[PDB]
Design a protein around this nucleic acid. Structure first.
Lengths: 92, 89, 91, 90, 91, 92
DNA sequence: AAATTGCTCTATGTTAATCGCAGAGCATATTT
DNA sequence: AAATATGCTCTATGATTAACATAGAGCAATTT
């Protein structure tokens, strides 16, 4: 699929999406988009995926939808986080 | 459901490698990074097109190494990574 | 919410997927999209929704991803298609 | 557009809205939302679209606008209603 | 290994492409793929090579991306083309 | 397959091989190499293919293998050349 | 000399992921 | 109340390209 492109040379859109949640805790798609500088359509499309694999869960308050990492989500993230660290250490 | 390229892209692994070994061959890159060969060449051609990498044909042996521009990119992107991982630390 | 649909004005592309899954049991994304006339993207985008609810399960058999219905996907499959014939019996 | 959501798993709103007309004939937008179990703002929207297509039209019962089904709408109903029956076949 | 080309038996896809741009001036992946009847992937892939060698440059026009031979690209397109004619008269 | 390269940018190796036969008629393998500057291992791989297609058949004269253009190889070779002529014409 | 073997790159198709556009379901803000 | 414009926010799906596999093919070095 469309993994490595000019905009995504090293990290994929999800990398930015997840990392953003690790900080804000919970945020809307619109939030994720404008903050990570990623076109909305790419965000929700990725969110759906994360929702399929239990990495993220919804949070409806009638009108406003919030997304947040699941325990296995944060599990995925430190794991990938440390892997990055590894890559950046061998390299330099 | 691409469980292989979650956070990092293949292009990334390819770069970082040519940054730690400098000179390398396609199959060698593929093997050392567990990235299907056909993905390596494809990305190599793009990289070669952007001038981030150059070919080094020594006799019949084909080699690919980074360039002043490729290294700039490599280090530049890598830094962007660190700044992104910092606040999570 | 302006409207113009000549395809899903009574049935959601979701039902077409759910149902088709009962027949063959398991099928790649490309697969149902062909036997259901439902565009590819719409299929995958909708199967990720079912995976979220637990109405379907992923079964990778080598290089191809085979999506199969689940117990929860069966409850709904038979329970929903019930209130359906219900609708048409009443009218 | 937005079709299959959390409320609409199999049958779209129009599915119920139209069924309401097959049964009660003329029903105010208000009475639809109530029987249809579909949110009001939604009912108005769908009828507006259904009106546009000539699938349904208004009837001024004095100070109240009751909406009625049309032969155009009936044909669509019976038609769709059979593509469904046909689907449940399995 | 083994040979079985039904198309490129005397001409390379890179031969058509280079040529097309020499007369059209500028074009997109699509324009090349449609005219030269060379498949998309093959076209785009050969452009990368032309870019690497500097035989072609990108002309960015908004969301539009065209290509055209360069100084060294043109002279090449005309150089080998002569050797082509050279061969066509050896008979 | 390997059709385009730094060497065979415009013309394929076959092109060179066939086109020389239309002009030496029968030539041996090594004679083809020296003229068209194509490695022996290549002059062979392609002949092997040409033989199987009957486009060009071998004629024994002493001990050196000869290769002459059969009738099929004439039609083919003329079909390629005629199309070559076109391409260069539209380019202009 | 030629055919077997072997490494590397080419052609090109199947599937898939980006991100743009036209919806649509519904809660808000307005209609005054 | 309910109706219009309405503003959110997500879905349906089309178009461009990437991931990666299959079938070549250019060329050594080995073996018939």
């Amino acid at each position: 699929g469309k993994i490595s492109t000019d905009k995504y040379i090293f990290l994929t859109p999800r990398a930015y999406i997840i990392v953003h949640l690790l900080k804000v805790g919970k945020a809307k798609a619109s939030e994720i988009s404008e903050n990570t500088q990623i076109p909305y359509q790419t965000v929700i499309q990725n969110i759906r995926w994360l929702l399929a694999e239990g990495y993220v869960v919804k949070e409806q308050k009638g009108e406003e939808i919030y997304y947040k990492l699941t325990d296995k989500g944060k599990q995925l993230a430190t794991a990938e986080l440390e892997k990055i660290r590894k890559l950046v250490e061998v390299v330099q």
